[PDB]
Amino acid sequence: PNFFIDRPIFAWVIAIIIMLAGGLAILKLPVAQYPTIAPPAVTISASYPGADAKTVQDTVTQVIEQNMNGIDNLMYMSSNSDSTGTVQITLTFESGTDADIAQVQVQNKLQLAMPLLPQEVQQQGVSVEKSSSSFLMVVGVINTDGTMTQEDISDYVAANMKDAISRTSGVGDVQLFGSQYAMRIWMNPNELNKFQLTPVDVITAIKAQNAQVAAGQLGGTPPVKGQQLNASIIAQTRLTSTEEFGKILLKVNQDGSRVLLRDVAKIELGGENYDIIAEFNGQPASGLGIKLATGANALDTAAAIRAELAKMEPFFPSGLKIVYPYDTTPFVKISIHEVVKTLVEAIILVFLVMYLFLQNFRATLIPTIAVPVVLLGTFAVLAAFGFSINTLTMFGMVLAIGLLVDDAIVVVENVERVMAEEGLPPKEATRKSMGQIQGALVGIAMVLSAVFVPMAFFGGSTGAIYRQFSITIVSAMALSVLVALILTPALCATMLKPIAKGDHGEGKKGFFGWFNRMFEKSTHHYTDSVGGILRSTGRYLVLYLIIVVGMAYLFVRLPSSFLPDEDQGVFMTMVQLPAGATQERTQKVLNEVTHYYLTKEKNNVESVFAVNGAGAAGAGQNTGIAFVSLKDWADRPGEENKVEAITMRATRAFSQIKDAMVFAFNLPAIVELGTATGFDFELIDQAGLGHEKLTQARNQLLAEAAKHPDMLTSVRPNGLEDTPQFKIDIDQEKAQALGVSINDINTTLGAAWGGSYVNDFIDRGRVKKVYVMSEAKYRMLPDDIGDWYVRAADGQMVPFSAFSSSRWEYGSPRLERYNGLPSMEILGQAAPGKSTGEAMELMEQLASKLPTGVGYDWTGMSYQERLSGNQAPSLYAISLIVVFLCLAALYESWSIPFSVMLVVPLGVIGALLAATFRGLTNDVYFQVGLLTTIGLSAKNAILIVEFAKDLMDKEGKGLIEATLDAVRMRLRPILMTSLAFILGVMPLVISTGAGSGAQNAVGTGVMGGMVTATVLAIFFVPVFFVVVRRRFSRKNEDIEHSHTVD
Amino acid sequence: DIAQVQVQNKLQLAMPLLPQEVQQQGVSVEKSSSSFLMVVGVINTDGTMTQEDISDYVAANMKDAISRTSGVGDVQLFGSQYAMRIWMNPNELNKFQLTPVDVITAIKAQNAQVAAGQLGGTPPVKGQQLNASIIAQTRLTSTEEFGKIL
Amino acid sequence: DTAAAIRAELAKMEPFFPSGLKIVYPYDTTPFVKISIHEVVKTLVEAIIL
Amino acid sequence: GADAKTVQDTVTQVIEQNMNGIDNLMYMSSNSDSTGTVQITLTFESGTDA
Amino acid sequence: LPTGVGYDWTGMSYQERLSGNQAPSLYAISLIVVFLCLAALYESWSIPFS
Ligand SMILES: CCCCCCCCCCCCO[C@@H]1O[C@H](CO)[C@@H](O[C@H]2O[C@H](CO)[C@@H](O)[C@@H](O)[C@H]2O)[C@H](O)[C@H]1O
């Protein structure tokens, strides 16, 4: 402290060391958009081709839900049993659990369940994965020539690119969009009755002829003596071409005219699945979703991947061009450009405020060295704690440009003051001044970490968001007061100019700031004033409570956000067709939507990625989804040219004009979180009941909540409602007669209409599948059932209509389970200005109006909200107590802390003022902001209260005289700090361009807060101080003429 | 945890060399104190159900969640969950000239779900308009329809 | 704490139980750990007072 | 039974396709033998948790 | 060798190529630390250069 005054070089060395650590930690520090925030979930997925909802729910789903146990830290189980044969069991774990352990343990209980599965599922694959819906990129591959189909392209994807990109530095998970080439063999029902054959015979034919064989070796061990030759018996090799599959022999006819497979079926290299069709502006396309590697450079993973893709550009086939429908990268690059712009802008402002106020170039340079240094270092402390440059942490730093700016200003000011007041040369001046502010500053460090640390401890995904802020800011601050104590006092004692005693430079110069008088008169005005306002304090205690009450009202009205919705350069629109619809209808709708975007939005849109089959609801021809890419924002000027009005005019288009519901929206900021003002209700069956009764209970609760539009709003299920299905009752009696095997009946019906993955081959070097399914025109409408024949042991064919009863009924196409038992998921939010928690209470009281065997429970968003929500009071209680205790220590008082803690309202009010006059919302940013403001306001209170006491004691001055003196000397720096600040933050508040959502959320609260805080504080702080001090002691007193200095 | 995974990683090298009755009965790899943490009991005060009635409610309503709770290693049930218990008569089998094997292949063939497919499925024919779920053979839900097994 | 989690899970299952099904508690190392260490607390506080 | 090209095209490189994104991996090297044996070695950045 | 045939080092010679490619930066950082360290202890810029 006093130490580094006489050691400017040791100070420089600590500076330089921290700077080098900064630049070093800055070069090699990750960049991601946001940090890891979702409470880890592993996904088990199994595809059971052909299976209906109940078949996967009962054969795979429940057998795995029953063998999942003994895995550490299980929060809940959620299960999709989809009628496209797919099962998705999503195990979401307690937050911050080892993803690695969760995945492996889950999978090791799964491999224990593996033999208890059907063999179709066992061979199709059950996969355990770590769930992130946040793909760094979706890279598109298209074909302009018109040459290639979806699967053609897809195959090229899988066999030329998919894994060369998967090399590039920064790439973790690689995923392909579409389906790879399989041996697609399409049976003909006529040409199968012709030569008297069923699927089973096709099947064993294909297994037998297309395989490897456990061979042997010449000259093997043990040998015979004198041996000399050793080589490998090459046995049966699998079939390379489609032709060679045509050649496979099903049966020989009696006269020798033989039957090769080609005759009974159409044969082709085809897709392994044809559920989803991917169009890129109508153009044939497949895709690849690349993930940023588990903690690496987003922007350099992007630069490397795009550079790598182009090395493959000279070896890409005809008319094959690459495209980028979804790109986190330019939005993050631009986020960062604006954080660097802001911090350096704020800093420049500080130079203008500091010069055009102290007019000493060497005084002006000091903070210019002071916070860059705190900057670099702050980076280094976060580097050490394992963090990255994402949005939350960088705005975590901007959010505290002010405490840093303040820290420097406080000191330089106080020194310049000591010289202008006392005439001391600079060295002795900096010791007098550090001697003055040192203890206070350690105090500010203890009150600032007393407010900023309780906000590091929240639980669930909210706590994560906060932890980033807590540590960024506590570290900027910690290193800030450290710099404040080591270097800058050395920089004041070492490059600061001596001021002639009582200089003040009134007039003394023509071409620059007659201002000094203009400042001076006024600062006397300020104190001329203040004593009068002390002279009858009464009114202000009224005014104060007025304001305090107001602060509350204005506050209770502020709406309760989570984060601002950002125009990401990218938004999407999804399509839901009526029940049971076909690939063709949905595909029509996607085509229309695309035309609308590319035309009636020709100034804006750049790309549509129409995807048929994948929709928001779940899987099925039924659903459709479109990724809509916009041009770069320097080509989208106006208000009606940006995502807000674009999405609004797109749903405008598609609502009023269709037979199907097609909605458009922009993605949320953090790609997986709560809708803030709502919930996610799962209605559960705990007693022994079937789907009928549970859905009935669901409808009952659906109506019971439509009866409260005053609390609850748009209470809906998130799934597919019962569609009609087609039951084929096999009368085993009839087929028990005809000499057919029930096996062959089931499995021919199967391999016909659902299909059969049967065997494996080797295409051009890469192993791929062999599928056998009926051709198109012989398996579409229930009539085609007839065209299909099963052969008995006695040689006689049988039509299906000979033993197949058939009807229509309903069935559920999507069977959900919650924690092992049948459930139906109810989404919902609360009516406008009603609490989410209230809606939750009314929900529990409504679902309590349901039959026994119907129970309820909470998940995800409303899960973390029902456990962690009583923390907000307790942590700021710890905060209040810890700060009060800290000040009590810094002074030597159980009462004086009150005149400074009382300043806190004075700052909150303007931010609320500001929220409302800017129509913004109480989101996270506003709140970290709240604190920041409270922070400076309190710091200033602390320095005023200190100087007051310091006079009162260590000069003998009296209460009023000394509070006057105090406030007097602290007027100029508050004003300097506040100007540089309000002027640094200013650009945030009025700025559009990517991440303006954030910048505005921040800026508003701060600027308003700063305004009402300084302009209030400079009149209330002496009153707090003066009033509170009159309840202590009982005498000795008001007071002066005292005494030692000893 | 690491040990569990390594031991179980050698168990995956023994898994195919075990019988299919064992593999389907389930092999379990666990971490667990050799002592009982607690014994939770359920009864019925009236007698309104026998032992196995209850035991079934225990194994089919509760046990799956006690055994998922984080921190629970081994759960051991005193008793058993309901199965379709079918008690052959050796005489009544010698009569119609039948062995257990016929019971087995019968029950295997008659009682199963079936991969059926979709009307108007993927890939479809042009001009299509119907898409819905073919339901085939379903599992035998009740106790009677088990007698009717042919 | 495993015991607290289990009391919670069982309390979730309480309302969809059939006619007259009561849980009963034959064996628990748990209440002893609490009451034993609690008697060590009663002692700390008393001793302070002495 | 399979020969080297058969294991390297059916088993080996179907495994190297999934070894992406694993943390603190220095290099990968894989042997494809014609006695049915396939052997992959992942060498990690030094001091990585084994 | 022909266009498209390349080289790399692994195991021992990889670790040796790391030792040498690292050797310069190690002598720059250690020299710089001694210098700051001395500039600090002996409050000077002259003691360090000399
Ligand atoms: C950063 C810049 C801040 C912008 C400030 C712009 C002006 C708005 C606030 C000015 C506050 C001064 O308001 C102050 O109020 C008190 C009333 O209690 C007056 O006080 C008056 O009444 C008291 C006793 O009744 C007497 O001392 C009397 O001599 C008189 O001073 C002061 O004369 C007035 O100076």
Residue numbers in the entry:
A (entry chain B): 2 to 1047
B (entry chain A): 101 to 250
C (entry chain A): 301 to 350
D (entry chain C): 51 to 100
E (entry chain C): 851 to 900
Show me the paper's own sentences about this structure.
AcrAB-TolC is the major multidrug resistance efflux pump in Escherichia coli, where AcrB is the efflux transporter residing in the inner membrane of the bacterium, playing an important role in capturing and expelling a range of structurally diverse substrates. AcrB is homotrimeric with the three monomers suggested to cycle between three conformational states known as loose/access, tight/binding, and open/extrusion during substrate export. Crystallographic studies of AcrB have revealed that large substrates e.g. erythromycin bind the proximal pocket in the access/loose monomer (access binding pocket) while smaller substrates e.g., doxorubicin and minocycline bind the distal pocket in the binding/tight monomer (deep binding pocket).The proximal and distal sites are separated by a short “gate” loop (herein defined to consist of residues 615FGFAGR620) that has been suggested to regulate the progress of substrates through the export pathway. During efflux, large substrates such as erythromycin are proposed to undergo a sequential export process, first binding the proximal pocket, then passing the gate loop to the distal pocket, and subsequently being extruded out of the cell via TolC.
